[PDB]
Amino acid sequence: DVQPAGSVPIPDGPAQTWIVADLDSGQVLAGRDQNVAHPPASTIKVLLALVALDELDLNSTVVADVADTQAECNCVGVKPGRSYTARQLLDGLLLVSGNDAANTLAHMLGGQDVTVAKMNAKAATLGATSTHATTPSGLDGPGGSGASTAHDLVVIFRAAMANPVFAQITAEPSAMFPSDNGEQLIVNQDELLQRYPGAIGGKTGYTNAARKTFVGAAARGGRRLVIAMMYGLVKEGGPTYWDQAATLFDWGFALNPQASVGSL
């Protein structure tokens, strides 16, 4: 790791790369291999959300087709021939990591290939130049597993948090999603919201190639932090990803505000 001289040693955790940064100033407080590329898994859905929020009206609708509904789970439950709003799909995308929601948003954005090109273009405008999406969902695609870095993930999340709708959604405990029998309540799978006072958003991910990933943010004592963690596996009786995230936030909030190791 790299952390400021004299600071409290950062406890070991499952994440093999990670970064702790200030959401507002862009100061980097600490990092471990924060520029090393690994597959992002579902954390890349945040990048899809940015594109969707830029281009799509929240109340515009799409009729899902069969192709939209054929990716492996997680699924929010998109059904072919049914109508959904961009907002509904974004809730599905961000609360339950719905791959069907991702593919249906990609449908609204002009298709899979076009959506991936738009995501990569968006990463470039943000200076996230170590990021390459291959699918809208973060699933392995024909182009491979894709790539991001802990640094790029917080850069992307920082941009997303600036959007008031994104900030609202990522922090919602629940949302209503269309079903046959009307509407089904879906719950936010981000347990940091429930376990860590001051958490304001987050997105988890897993694939075999990515292992566990996470990006998210919290606010305490007037400061707002953003962290990302990549390429990790939880060992029996070891810290979980939720544990290490809380440990990193706690460490960051306790840090002398003048201390830093670099900037975004």
CATH no. for residue 13?
3.40.710.10
CB 79 within 8 A of CB 92: no
Give catalytic residues, as residue numbers.
42, 45, 97
**Helical residues (DSSP H) of the chain, grouped into ranges:** 45-55, 86-95, 99-108, 112-125, 150-161, 164-171, 192-195, 241-254
CB 156 within 8 A of CB 205: no
Q: Which amino acid is at 138?
A: G
How determined? Answer: X-ray
Q: What is the dihedral of CA 31, 203, 23, 245, to 10 degrees?
A: -50
Residue 2's DSSP bridge partners are 31
Phi, psi of 167, rounded to the nearest 5 degrees: -55, -40
Range of the domain at 9: 1-264
d(CA 95, CA 166): 11
Tokens of residue 19, six digits: 């970064």
CB 216 within 8 A of CB 226: yes
d(CA 189, CA 202): 9
d(CA 184, CA 187): 10
How far are the Cα atoms of 3, 40, 110, 172, 200 from residue 149, in angstroms, in the given order?
18, 8, 27, 26, 21
CB 174 within 8 A of CB 185: yes
* Domain count of the fold of the chain: 1
How far are the Cα atoms of 151, 233, 234, 240, 245 from residue 13, in angstroms, in the given order?
18, 9, 8, 8, 9
